[PDB]
Ligand binder design. Structure first.
Ligand code: ABF
Ligand code: ABF
Lengths: 217, 217
């Protein structure tokens, strides 16, 4: 879409931010606009936890104390974009970010504010490929089992996660039953994390549309 | 129960391997003895996959070609033991060995052959601690989720797996639906693997008795 639309929705996520708390912050262009909002709130919060390398650096551009996940028993909210989001507020995430890091911070937070532009909502999940983080020794075997589920897994060659794991991006599933899909893949030895955000979806969906932020809750 | 029982047991699995093929090898007192068996008919064996450093190196000094999981579609068999195994042939594995490679080598293998001493048959799994491998940034999270499930998880402090993750050994559990708890465990974000082989269990169960080994095909 446009960055003026990303902007709005990012700015709208600041409403949900409780005076004097540690804030869960994801990564990305829409997310960076939210961070600007928070910079207007550096003194009236405790800190911030981040699932992003770049996000951590910007939070430390406004003087916000970072915590790591092992330091808090909970977050109030975690604000992040998505790659694809359905009417059921289940997401495909982690296509261009730290999948594992994002799912952990997300499961630990109380509310999950999804801030998006016009182009993230889909009818059915799956055209945007599903990222699957895997133990390298299990890649082939996990690839076979995904072909078994109706996908076309593609080895994201050239890279590894910080964990030192590989990524299979799975093209060409029509993901009608996302809670059940995440069980199946979750069920596969070798599999570290699947980017299906279906069991813990968005609690609020804050979209940015040619006429402002529109919030769903 | 005894180191001769182990040895009668790991030798008795020897009858399960064939010519020109590739063997799955675990680790443990009792597989050693099977590794001790495997050498004698090394010439007819294409070579081996294993899930353990010690076995690998012992098979190597034997002139047994090692393969990796990325080279194969399948393995006729996996010989390994267990920490616990129930009447339903479900096992607690990886208190003692490399949880992730075992669960992975077992998944590529058609037939799992559990070689065991008097100490391994339980009726209800859970006395021997249940290993769960966990991305470190998630350790307390996954641990709060483990409590909910009637669990007392205990960080195995001072060590990590080859990839940099921690271990949580869960005590106090009465595990009567294993496939369920595995389901549930594979399902916390930050979990990497769980020491429940419940979906995929022991096909053959090889114990140690006083004279020969009881076997159960
Ligand atoms: O050339 P590209 O793919 O548009 O790269 C720039 C951007 O990368 C992103 O994740 C963006 O949201 C974005 O605008
Ligand atoms: O009695 P524990 O504490 O389970 O440890 C002994 C052993 O457990 C195993 O799986 C073995 O192969 C083995 O020798």
């Amino acid at each position: 879409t446009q960055d003026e639309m990303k902007k709005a929705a990012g700015w709208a996520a600041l409403k949900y931010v409780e005076k004097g708390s540690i804030v869960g912050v994801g990564t990305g262009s829409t997310v960076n606009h939210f961070i600007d909002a928070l910079g207007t709130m550096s003194e009236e919060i405790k800190g911030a936890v981040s699932s992003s390398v770049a996000s951590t650096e910007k939070l430390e551009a406004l003087g916000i104390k970072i915590f790591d996940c092992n330091e808090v028993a909970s977050l109030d909210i975690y604000v992040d974009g998505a790659d694809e989001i359905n009417a059921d507020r289940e997401m495909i995430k982690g296509g261009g970010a730290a999948l594992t890091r994002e799912k952990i911070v997300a499961a630990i937070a109380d509310k999950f504010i999804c801030i998006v532009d016009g182009t993230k909502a889909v009818d059915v999940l799956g055209t945007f490929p599903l990222p699957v983080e895997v133990i390298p020794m299990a890649r082939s075997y996990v690839a076979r089992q995904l072909v078994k589920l109706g996908g076309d897994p593609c080895y994201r060659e050239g890279v590894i996660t910080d964990n030192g794991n590989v990524i299979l991006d799975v093209y060409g599933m029509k993901i009608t039953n996302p809670k059940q899909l995440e069980d199946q893949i979750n069920a596969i030895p070798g599999v570290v994390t699947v980017g299906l955000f279906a069991h813990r979806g968005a609690d609020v969906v804050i979209t940015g549309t040619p006429e402002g932020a529109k919030i769903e809750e």
